[PDB]
């Protein structure tokens, strides 16, 4: 019931399984739930921040992609003496409404705007709080027919609370039915260099964030779409015939056989 | 019931009807009822004699209606 079978693909679960799992995983994952948090840290503000060559304080600083800043013309239009100077016009603006501040934008992807500002409340301190609990920090603000589900006496269930806590989770948890991934296919720490450093960090780890956002952008910007219908997995093919046969072993041992193996072949 | 809904659906189209009186009325139908009251405009009455008339606004009582005859497009209408 819990999985496909021996081929081990395509798992599945039930709730408290998750809720436990999540509760345990959470120290590893501190990630802001709402998309609305990320604004100029999203993907498209990084693209536009590239195509237009803009520097975000927490964004990575890239190459021009258009080599030339050089055309500069004064003119009846441009003259300082006809233009009214108020406000700095920060870069971030030019990443915000890029058809507005940064003129002649090219290959510029139109950003998202305005999500609802998630107000979700959660108890990360007391777990003896019942299901529906007015939060301290909220503003003050014939006999035989009956209600339907009130037939059952009480709505709050031992699970339902963490059913709620799981109603919001990043991709893995909120889904209780999914399939299998290579171990390295999982990326644990990708989350952490998507976040604000806040302050207390040294410029070491901050600059590190800028590094990994840079690389991240690059890893995003180039999809592929190949297909290998030609190549049967090299093992599957080569293990055909004779000179190879299949067995089991302890891992470390196979390691050793390899150690002398290629050690030889070097010699 | 469906026999009433059909009526409500022909509101606005032009309708023919017959009463226990013996006369038939023809005109655009404006208001109906669950009783089967009617309210028509530009009516062209025709009794047993053949006597034609014009009535600007007209009411009926359902009890008095024998049978109504309604527009052709109202056969594709939903049941």
């Amino acid at each position: 019931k819990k999985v496909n079978g021996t081929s081990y693909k395509k798992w599945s679960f039930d709730l408290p399984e998750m809720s436990n799992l999540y509760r345990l995983s959470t120290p590893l994952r501190d990630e802001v739930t709402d998309k609305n948090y990320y604004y100029l840290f999203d993907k498209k503000s990084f693209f536009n921040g590239k195509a237009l060559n803009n520097a975000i304080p927490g964004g990575p600083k890239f190459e021009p992609l258009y080599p030339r800043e050089e055309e500069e013309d004064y003119n009846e239009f441009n003259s300082i003496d006809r233009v009214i100077f108020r406000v700095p016009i920060r870069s971030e603006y030019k990443v915000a409404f890029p058809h507005l501040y940064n003129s002649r934008p090219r290959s510029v992807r139109i950003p998202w705007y305005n999500n609802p500002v998630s107000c979700i409340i959660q108890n990360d301190e007391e777990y003896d709080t019942p299901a529906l609990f007015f939060d301290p920090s909220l503003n003050p603000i014939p006999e035989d027919f009956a209600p339907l589900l009130a037939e059952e006496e009480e709505l709050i269930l031992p699970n339902t609370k963490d059913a709620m806590s799981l109603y919001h989770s990043p991709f893995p948890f909120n889904r209780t039915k999914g399939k299998m991934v290579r171990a390295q296919d999982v990326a644990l720490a990708k989350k952490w260099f998507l976040q604000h450093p806040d302050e207390e960090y040294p410029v070491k780890v901050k600059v590190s964030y800028q590094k990994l956002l840079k690389n991240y952008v690059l890893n995003e910007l180039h999809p592929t779409l190949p297909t290998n219908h030609n190549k049967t997995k090299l093992l599957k093919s080569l293990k055909n015939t004779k000179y190879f046969q299949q067995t089991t072993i302890d891992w470390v041992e196979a390691g050793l056989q390899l150690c002398r193996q290629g050690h030889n072949m070097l010699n | 019931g469906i026999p009433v809904k059909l009526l409500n659906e022909a509101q606005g189209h032009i309708v023919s009807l017959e009463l226990t009186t013996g006369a038939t009325y023809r005109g655009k139908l404006v208001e109906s009822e669950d009783s089967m009251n009617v309210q028509l405009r530009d009516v062209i009455a025709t009794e047993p004699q053949g006597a034609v008339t014009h009535m600007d606004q007209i009411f009926v009582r359902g009890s008095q209606i024998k049978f109504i005859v309604v527009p052709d497009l109202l056969k594709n209408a939903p049941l």
Binding site: - | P3, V4, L6, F67, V69, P71, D72, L79
Partner: protein
């Protein structure tokens, strides 16, 4: 009940009225008042005939019902 009345649905019928006229055509709808809806109707006053179309008869006016033909394809 009314199980028999649903069985008549979409058959050509011959309906005699208290007025004497006899209407003929398929049956589209039936009611709790016995209001009948008929498609492509013809009254037969009597060697006589007239074309109406869609007709909705009242319950008071109807006397009896009688099948002309089977349900049409």
């Amino acid at each position: 009940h009314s199980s028999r009345l649903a069985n008549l649905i979409d058959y050509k019928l011959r309906v005699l009225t208290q007025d004497g006229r006899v209407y003929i055509g398929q049956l589209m709808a039936f009611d709790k008042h016995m209001n009948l809806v008929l498609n492509e109707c013809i009254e037969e006053r009597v060697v006589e005939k007239r074309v109406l179309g869609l007709t909705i008869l009242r319950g008071e006016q109807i006397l009896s019902t009688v099948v002309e033909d089977k349900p049409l394809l």
